[PDB]
Amino acid sequence: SSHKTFRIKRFLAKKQKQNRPIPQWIRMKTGNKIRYNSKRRHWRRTKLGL
Amino acid sequence: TKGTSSFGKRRNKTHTLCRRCGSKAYHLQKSTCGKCGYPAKRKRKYNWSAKAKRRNTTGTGRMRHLKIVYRRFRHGFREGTTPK
Amino acid sequence: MKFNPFVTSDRSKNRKRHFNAPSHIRRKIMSSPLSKELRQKYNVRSMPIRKDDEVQVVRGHYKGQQIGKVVQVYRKKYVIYIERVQREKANGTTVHVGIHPSKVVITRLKLDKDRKKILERKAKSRQ
Amino acid sequence: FIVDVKANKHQIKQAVKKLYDIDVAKVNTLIRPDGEKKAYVRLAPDYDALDVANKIGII
Amino acid sequence: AKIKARDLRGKKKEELLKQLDDLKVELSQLRVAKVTGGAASKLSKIRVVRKSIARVLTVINQTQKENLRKFYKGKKYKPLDLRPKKTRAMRRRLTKHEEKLKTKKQQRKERLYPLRKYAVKA
Amino acid sequence: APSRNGMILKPHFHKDWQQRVDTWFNQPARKIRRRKARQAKARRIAPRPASGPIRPIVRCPTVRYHTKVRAGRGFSLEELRVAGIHKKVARTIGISVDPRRRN
RNA sequence: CGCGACCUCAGAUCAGACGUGGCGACCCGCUGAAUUUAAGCAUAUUAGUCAGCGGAGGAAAAGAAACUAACCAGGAUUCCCUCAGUAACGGCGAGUGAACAGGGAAGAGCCCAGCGCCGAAUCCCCGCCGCGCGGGGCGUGGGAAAUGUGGCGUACGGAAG
RNA sequence: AGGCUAAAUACCGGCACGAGACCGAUAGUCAACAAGUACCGUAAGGGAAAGUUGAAAAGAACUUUGAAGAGAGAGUUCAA
RNA sequence: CGGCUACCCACCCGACCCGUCUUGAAACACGGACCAAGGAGUCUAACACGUGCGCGAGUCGGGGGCUCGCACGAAAGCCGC
RNA sequence: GAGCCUUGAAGCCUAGGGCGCGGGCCCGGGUGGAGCCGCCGCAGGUGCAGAUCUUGGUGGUAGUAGCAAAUAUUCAAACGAGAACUUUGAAGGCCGAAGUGGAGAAGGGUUCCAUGUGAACAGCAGUUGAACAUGGGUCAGUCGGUCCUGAGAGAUGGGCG
RNA sequence: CGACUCUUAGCGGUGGAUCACUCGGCUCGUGCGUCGAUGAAGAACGCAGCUAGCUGCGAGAAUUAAUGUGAAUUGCAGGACACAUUGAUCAUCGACACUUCGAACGCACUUGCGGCCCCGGGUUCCUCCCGGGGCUACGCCUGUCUGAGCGUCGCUU
Ligand SMILES: [Mg+2]
Ligand SMILES: [Mg+2]
Ligand SMILES: [Mg+2]
Ligand SMILES: [Mg+2]
Ligand SMILES: [Mg+2]
Ligand SMILES: [Mg+2]
Ligand SMILES: [Mg+2]
Ligand SMILES: [Mg+2]
Ligand SMILES: [Mg+2]
Ligand SMILES: [Mg+2]
Ligand SMILES: [Mg+2]
Ligand SMILES: [Mg+2]
Ligand SMILES: [Mg+2]
Ligand SMILES: [Mg+2]
Ligand SMILES: [Mg+2]
Ligand SMILES: [Mg+2]
Ligand SMILES: [Mg+2]
Ligand SMILES: [Mg+2]
Ligand SMILES: [Mg+2]
Ligand SMILES: [Mg+2]
Ligand SMILES: [Mg+2]
Ligand SMILES: [Mg+2]
Ligand SMILES: [Mg+2]
Ligand SMILES: [Mg+2]
Ligand SMILES: [Mg+2]
Ligand SMILES: [Mg+2]
Ligand SMILES: [Mg+2]
Ligand SMILES: [Mg+2]
Ligand SMILES: [Mg+2]
Ligand SMILES: [Mg+2]
Ligand SMILES: [Mg+2]
Ligand SMILES: [Mg+2]
Ligand SMILES: [Mg+2]
Ligand SMILES: [Mg+2]
Ligand SMILES: [Mg+2]
Ligand SMILES: [Mg+2]
Ligand SMILES: [Mg+2]
Ligand SMILES: [Mg+2]
Ligand SMILES: [Mg+2]
Ligand SMILES: [Mg+2]
Ligand SMILES: [Mg+2]
Ligand SMILES: [Mg+2]
Ligand SMILES: [Mg+2]
Ligand SMILES: [Mg+2]
Ligand SMILES: [Mg+2]
Ligand SMILES: [Mg+2]
Ligand SMILES: [Mg+2]
Ligand SMILES: [Mg+2]
Ligand SMILES: [Mg+2]
Ligand SMILES: [Mg+2]
Ligand SMILES: [Mg+2]
Ligand SMILES: [Mg+2]
Ligand SMILES: [Mg+2]
Ligand SMILES: [Mg+2]
Ligand SMILES: [Mg+2]
Ligand SMILES: [Mg+2]
Ligand SMILES: [Zn+2]
């Protein structure tokens, strides 16, 4: 919506923060087995549901 | 027209984020939650579903206060001060 | 044979407690034996590894009588590094090679106020 | 200025006056889409923003 | 050896606030400098200045609580935060005096017929 | 269901019994706990004998067992009176008293 | 008309204190079906279970006979082996089904209302005084509760004088 | 027709521990791994797949072809 | 030089596509595109028969207790009024 | 079994030799890199060709059907290795004001903007994009919420349970 | 002669079966018995130099103080390197601190609207003026205060 409330905007803020790629400085960490982020949500494919 | 053409009319919402559980079970029209019943002082748990308690019982969260009680019980709930 | 009903013989439990050991237990796990002329001098068998002490490899590929010195103690990898025990990369740059502290024998120790206390405690306990 | 979300215009004005010893004309706050709060604080005509910026980091 | 909490306990609370004010000013300066792409060597002092601020605040609160406990020592109806915080179960339990307190009938019974040490063989 | 020849059976397994089955896998542990408790009690009460309170001579009520004699709970008040010791002192002496039994 | 005492009562953000909710494997109180079996189905079985609600503790309930037996009697309660798939219940069909002995684990017993005597010798609160570490109880004086009944002395095994 | 009480008894939840004629990654708890996670339905709710380089990255310097993906030599390792 | 075979080819003869319901299946009856992994008569209580063992008009300590705390001991040994 | 093994265990492959009627097994060779097996007894979650069997993978179909609702594209140049799909200019057209225009409410939540690459996404391609990576972007006394009640929902008093 | 098809072997590709390994489960037993109005379980948000998730934390936010141990963490520069000052990490953890919702407690929750007391700045003061601190939910127990009764009683107008 064009106008929303503070709670919904704060909830969307964390999704915006989380929708970020994997940093390239942890790939060389000892014991690291993460190759790519499996929680990347697309605005068109997967709807977060309010 | 009961299918695809009728699905396009879905515009409103009947559930938002709850206040006690944070899930999307809170009903706007009935003003009650579908997972806990926020107006009710007691949280609604049921033995019919075993998986409901698995996602809601203690230990499945942070336990910011319950983490330290198990640690302080091993010493008998001391209140003094370490020597020196 | 084990007799204490409070210590386990489970292989999985031992491996877990060894691989997830805290930093103050890793320093005790990473212990190296002392030389023969120094063992009779200090009346102690083994001693943990620190950054300043010299050491000599006894087993492995980079083994011999050349005296060396440690430069890094990698507690996370249960390994130590020596300045002369090194290897060339593809581009020719040098890089240290990791050797386990159990496969190396110490010849010199840093005489520290805490090291002397540990030595005398071990000697008095061995009696 | 990127300020806390709990601060209002009066608190922003008081904090600026106490930290930089400069007068404030008005404050326009907005909640960024990332969750922070950004405030445009207008200085009095006697003060210049260039010297305040040179004194506090930004040039 | 930047800021140690053991030496801060000797200074009075008037000097602690003065030592914390300039520390917060330095933290703010470091935060403003962090936004600039340069000065990468100063980007590591934020952690230590924050820890020192935390240490100063800890000493301040420790001194305040010590003074408050010394003031409220030996007085009835002490504040709730000064009252013990073991658990809710032991707070509602009876005190040791009430547990050891017994009725006059039981006292007279125990005084008249005590538990005698005995043995049965010849 | 029946066969050529066999004893008619009425097993009482029609109820939901599998959800209440008591397996005695803790029997050695229970016996060890009981033995340790007995040893601890005897060590704490060492001057006094185990099963301290003396028990009287008791005949079995029913006609099936009335030919043999067995132990009991406590001595009667009449027996205490003929013995000549007070009722309340026998408990701390080590004599179990049964006020309900008659003579 | 007023004043005062008692008695049923109202208000406070009065001083102090207490309950809410969560977990719920074990335990306590209530009501609570049907699928199934009966080769069909109503009584019955499933089951006084599942689901539902209300509570607490490391255990809870039980627990000192308005008991069991009918002979040479036993003696709180709890749990185990036997009694026993027995007595008995049941369209006496399907099926259901204990108890007393006895042997073991453990074994701890008591209080009060009442009847009577004691000048209410009783209890809570407030404040100064004499005490100990981490803070609460002993001796002093007034404000209440209480004679429509504090407390010692008493408990069916008798007790009191 | 009033009340209190530990004992032997039970414990698939909780905090720790020990053991196994059990399972060995389509098995074993749904979950050995960022698992009640991703995802699905408005909601009650449903619910996954997914372990193995090498002793040590020592993860292929450098030359050449191609814009790059990639490949030909070369190089580390006993072994690419 | 000798060699059957889990290699290929040819001729002669015989040769319908497997599994189960059925009196009758290759059927114009049903299932199967192919391959790898998983997959189905188990366990408890009771009964009847037969067999092996030990004792024997007796038999059975599975229920408890005893010796010493024990990795193997949640075993084993014993009760004898 | 004083069993075999980093002078090579398990596993896998094999126009090789050979045994047993058979279930199967032995040896040779090639991969493989750390365990395995014979004999005497014991206990099984113990043998697959099917169950419109469960999971995973792969074929014929087959480079086949299909990339056909709404009139239509063309010329030149530039940036580029690469041009029909990008950009600019020109020509020819459509939507023709109830639009293929300009704004909004619900809903979406960063999709908006700038820069940069071109393996994945766009059902062909791409220098292009609502894709990817980085960095920015939403400023109110007088725009709306906040105020008021409407249908309606709802606590205390009280009642029921 | 070629092409296509079929059957075998070698190599190669898709495929991820068997084998070996296991910081994981399942089962059995033992020890203890611990939540909250002094704010429980759970949820939301935020916190790291570079940080998306898990984990760990609460504006003192990838940890503070103290004790034990004794020279580090690590992907990368920096940084306390100092230890005949106080000394890194780790563990323990009894001392401080612990944002919002949540039994959730000022009313409702659209983060709005208030009401009292106190402290700093505004016309040096109340009068619907800014910031900060404390209190402001229900029922109930003991006591105090306030006050209603043509409920009963005594003296009095
Ligand atoms: Mg490795
Ligand atoms: Mg959804
Ligand atoms: Mg294990
Ligand atoms: Mg038959
Ligand atoms: Mg039937
Ligand atoms: Mg029927
Ligand atoms: Mg049934
Ligand atoms: Mg019934
Ligand atoms: Mg139930
Ligand atoms: Mg409750
Ligand atoms: Mg409890
Ligand atoms: Mg009685
Ligand atoms: Mg029988
Ligand atoms: Mg009946
Ligand atoms: Mg029957
Ligand atoms: Mg019945
Ligand atoms: Mg009674
Ligand atoms: Mg009773
Ligand atoms: Mg008990
Ligand atoms: Mg098995
Ligand atoms: Mg799986
Ligand atoms: Mg090149
Ligand atoms: Mg078959
Ligand atoms: Mg048929
Ligand atoms: Mg037919
Ligand atoms: Mg057939
Ligand atoms: Mg057919
Ligand atoms: Mg047909
Ligand atoms: Mg078919
Ligand atoms: Mg198989
Ligand atoms: Mg090899
Ligand atoms: Mg290996
Ligand atoms: Mg099978
Ligand atoms: Mg098959
Ligand atoms: Mg099929
Ligand atoms: Mg797979
Ligand atoms: Mg296909
Ligand atoms: Mg075609
Ligand atoms: Mg079309
Ligand atoms: Mg060009
Ligand atoms: Mg054009
Ligand atoms: Mg035209
Ligand atoms: Mg119009
Ligand atoms: Mg339009
Ligand atoms: Mg681009
Ligand atoms: Mg495409
Ligand atoms: Mg865009
Ligand atoms: Mg994007
Ligand atoms: Mg204006
Ligand atoms: Mg308005
Ligand atoms: Mg109502
Ligand atoms: Mg009511
Ligand atoms: Mg192949
Ligand atoms: Mg510290
Ligand atoms: Mg409320
Ligand atoms: Mg305030
Ligand atoms: Zn909820």
Swiss-Prot record, chain B:
Keywords: Acetylation, Cytoplasm, Metal-binding, Phosphoprotein, Ribonucleoprotein, Ribosomal protein, RNA-binding, rRNA-binding, Zinc, Zinc-finger
GO cellular component term of the entry, any: cytosolic large ribosomal subunit
Subunit structure: Component of the large ribosomal subunit.
GO biological process, one term: positive regulation of signal transduction by p53 class mediator
Segments traversing the membrane: none
Gene name linked to the record: Rpl37
Start-end of C4-type zinc fingers: 18-36
Pfam families: Ribosomal_L37e
Binding site for Zn(2+): C18, C21, C33, C36
Source organism phylogeny: Eukaryota, Metazoa, Chordata, Craniata, Vertebrata
Gene Ontology terms for molecular function: MDM2/MDM4 family protein binding; rRNA binding; structural constituent of ribosome; ubiquitin ligase inhibitor activity; zinc ion binding
Family in the record: Belongs to the eukaryotic ribosomal protein eL37 family.
Name this polypeptide is given: Large ribosomal subunit protein eL37
Biological role: Component of the large ribosomal subunit. The ribosome is a large ribonucleoprotein complex responsible for the synthesis of proteins in the cell.
Compartments in which it is found: Cytoplasm
Residues where N6-acetyllysine is found: K9
Signal peptide: none
UniProt organism field: Mus musculus (Mouse)
Swiss-Prot record, chain D:
Transmembrane region(s): none
Localisation per UniProt entry: Cytoplasm; Nucleus
Post-translational modification: N-terminus is methylated by METTL11A/NTM1.
Described function: Component of the large ribosomal subunit. The ribosome is a large ribonucleoprotein complex responsible for the synthesis of proteins in the cell. Binds a specific region on the 26S rRNA. May promote p53/TP53 degradation possibly through the stimulation of MDM2-mediated TP53 polyubiquitination.
Quaternary structure and partners: Component of the large ribosomal subunit. Interacts with LYAR and GNL2. Interacts with MDM2; this interaction may promote MDM2-mediated p53/TP53 polyubiquitination. Directly interacts (via BIB domain) with IPO5, IPO7, KPNB1 and TNPO1; these interactions are involved in RPL23A nuclear import for the assembly of ribosomal subunits. Interacts with IPO8.
Family to which this protein belongs: Belongs to the universal ribosomal protein uL23 family.
Domain notes: The N-terminal beta-like import receptor binding (BIB) domain mediates interaction with IPO5, IPO7, KPNB1 and TNPO1.
Name of the molecule in the record: Large ribosomal subunit protein uL23
Species per Swiss-Prot/TrEMBL record: Mus musculus (Mouse)
Lineage of producing organism: Eukaryota, Metazoa, Chordata, Craniata, Vertebrata
Span within the parent record: 98 to 156 of 156
Swiss-Prot record, chain E:
Chain positions with N6-acetyllysine modification: K18, K42
Per UniProt, location of the Glycyl lysine isopeptide (Lys-Gly) (interchain with G-Cter in SUMO2) cross-link in this chain: K24
Any one of the GO BP annotations: translation at postsynapse
Any one Gene Ontology cellular component term annotated for this protein: synapse
Region described as Disordered: 99-122
PTM sites of type Phosphoserine: S28
InterPro entries: Ribosomal_uL29, Ribosomal_uL29_CS, Ribosomal_uL29_euk, Ribosomal_uL29_sf
MF-aspect GO terms: structural constituent of ribosome
Subcellular location: Cytoplasm
Family: Belongs to the universal ribosomal protein uL29 family.
NCBIfam families tied to this protein: L29
Full protein name: Large ribosomal subunit protein uL29
Annotated source species: Mus musculus
Gene: Rpl35
From Swiss-Prot, chain F:
GO BP term (any one): blastocyst development
Residues found modified as Phosphoserine: S51, S76
Location in or out of the cell: Cytoplasm
Keyword presence, Ribosomal protein: yes
Coiled-coil residue windows: none
Modified residues (N6-acetyllysine): K15
GO molecular function: structural constituent of ribosome
Record keywords: Acetylation, Cytoplasm, Isopeptide bond, Phosphoprotein, Ribonucleoprotein, Ribosomal protein, Ubl conjugation
Claim: Ubl conjugation is one of the keywords in the record: yes
GO CC aspect terms: cytoplasm; cytosol; cytosolic large ribosomal subunit; endoplasmic reticulum; nucleolus; postsynapse; presynapse; ribosome
Function: Component of the large ribosomal subunit. The ribosome is a large ribonucleoprotein complex responsible for the synthesis of proteins in the cell.
Family: Belongs to the eukaryotic ribosomal protein eL13 family.
Description of how the protein assembles with itself and partners: Component of the large ribosomal subunit.
Protein name as annotated: Large ribosomal subunit protein eL13
Portion of the full-length sequence here: 2 to 104 of 211
